[PDB]
Write an enzyme that holds these catalytic residues in place. Structure first.
Site, short mmCIF file in Angstrom:
data_model
loop_
_atom_site.label_atom_id
_atom_site.label_comp_id
_atom_site.label_asym_id
_atom_site.label_seq_id
_atom_site.Cartn_x
_atom_site.Cartn_y
_atom_site.Cartn_z
CB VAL A 51 61.69 39.75 107.26
CG1 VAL A 51 62.34 39.19 108.25
CG2 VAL A 51 62.52 39.86 105.78
N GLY A 52 59.48 39.30 104.46
CA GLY A 52 58.67 39.83 103.44
C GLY A 52 58.51 38.94 102.32
N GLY A 57 57.02 39.26 97.94
CA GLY A 57 56.58 39.97 96.57
C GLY A 57 56.32 38.97 95.50
CE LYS A 58 54.05 42.49 91.10
NZ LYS A 58 55.55 43.07 91.50
CE1 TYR A 59 57.47 39.46 88.49
CE2 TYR A 59 57.86 41.60 89.73
CZ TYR A 59 57.13 40.72 88.67
OH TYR A 59 56.59 41.55 87.55
CB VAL A 73 62.65 38.94 101.76
CG1 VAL A 73 64.02 39.42 102.25
CG2 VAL A 73 62.56 39.28 100.24
CG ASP A 111 59.24 48.48 91.65
OD1 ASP A 111 58.06 49.21 91.66
OD2 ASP A 111 59.30 47.48 92.40
#
Ligand SMILES: O=C1c2c(O)cccc2C(=O)c2c([N+](=O)[O-])ccc(O)c21
EC number: 2.7.11.1
Length: 325
Positions: free
Chosen positions: A39-40, A42-44, A47, A150
């Protein structure tokens, strides 16, 4: 510089509360959770929507990308400290791949609609309602001695059908300690406060209030992102073009900040652009004098001047939202 509020939270609490480096993770059972769909990302991390095999309950599985052990203990400790607070994502378990030891943080299930598609449909009142909900989360984490660092639309999950909000991704969050000089390479470029852009390391909770200001400005003016800089240097220029250079200079002298010759050259000399100058046919239905007054009190160069999360919640702009509660 020090926070004007909640400055001694970590000073009064036991070392174990904020000493995250001294955390020893109690690894759970990796077999308890199954990935159902991504579902998602990011650079870290990556998900996925998952399922708890024991109770067949939906959940969220955040598989972390390779990173320093310290950073991982930091995110976990903060999550354990905030669990149960208003609108704070809830960490349910922590597991790891036996063979590669890849960590996964298990959260309560969160429904979401990407902001680029959700925001355009929000009414004047929806915006007041959701920002208020976000402010609860921010006042709470600050009251617990933590800066999210953030804040941005991507990190604010919203289930519009159920009108439920959650502040997510505490991977860049930190504990506030008076006088500590933090890394300025945090938050996302379009939401970085002036303090990060000019290298003022002893910042505080107020950082999140600028980020919130940027998000809010983008929402009422339908201009996402509001401050669209290509790189850090340009990010300050775009900001200076709106708030004016005079205010920037007052700020820099107060904190005895030395602007890099090159950067100083890029900024230039600019007059202030009134907020109403941003109203147009596409956003006239969302721009109101109370919205403008609120936004104006958030986007201040001087972090000590910005409204605190607690102050923000009592602004008349949210009057009906509070009344509704
Ligand atoms: O970090 C998170 C995260 C979290 O820490 C706790 C609950 C949910 C999420 C999440 O859902 C998420 C998404 N995404 O929207 O798919 C994209 C990038 C992320 O970095 C996260």
């Amino acid at each position: 510089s020090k926070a004007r509020v909640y400055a001694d939270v970590n000073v009064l609490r036991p070392k174990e509360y904020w000493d995250y480096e001294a955390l020893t993770v109690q690894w759970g059972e990796q077999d308890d959770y199954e990935v159902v769909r991504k579902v998602g990302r990011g650079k870290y991390s990556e998900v996925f929507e998952g399922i708890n095999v024991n109770n067949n309950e939906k959940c969220i599985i955040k598989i972390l990308k390779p990173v320093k052990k310290k950073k991982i203990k930091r995110e976990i400790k903060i999550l354990q400290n905030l669990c149960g607070g208003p609108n704070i994502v809830k960490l349910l378990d922590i597991v790891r791949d036996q063979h590669s030891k890849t960590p996964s943080l298990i959260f309560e299930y969160v429904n979401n609609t990407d902001f680029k598609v959700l925001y355009p449909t929000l009414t004047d009142y929806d915006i007041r309602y959701y920002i208020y909900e976000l402010l609860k989360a921010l006042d709470y984490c600050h009251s617990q001695g933590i800066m999210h660092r953030d804040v941005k639309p991507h990190n604010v999950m919203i289930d519009h059908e159920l009108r439920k909000l959650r502040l997510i991704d505490w991977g860049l969050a930190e504990f506030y300690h008076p006088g500590k000089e933090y890394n300025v390479r945090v938050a996302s470029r379009y939401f970085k406060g002036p303090e990060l852009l000019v290298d003022l390391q002893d910042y505080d909770y107020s950082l999140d209030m600028w980020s919130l200001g940027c998000m809010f400005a983008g929402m009422i003016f339908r201009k996402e992102p509001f401050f669209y800089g290509h790189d850090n240097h340009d990010q300050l220029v775009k900001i200076a073009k709106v708030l004016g250079t005079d205010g920037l200079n007052v700020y820099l002298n107060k904190y005895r900040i030395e602007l890099d010759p090159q950067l100083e050259a890029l900024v230039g000399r600019h007059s202030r652009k009134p907020w109403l100058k941003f109203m147009n046919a596409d956003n006239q239905h969302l721009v109101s004098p109370e919205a403008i007054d609120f936004l104006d009190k958030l986007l201040r160069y001087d972090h000590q001047e910005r409204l605190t999360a607690l102050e923000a919640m009592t602004h008349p702009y949210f009057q009906q939202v509070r009344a509704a509660e």
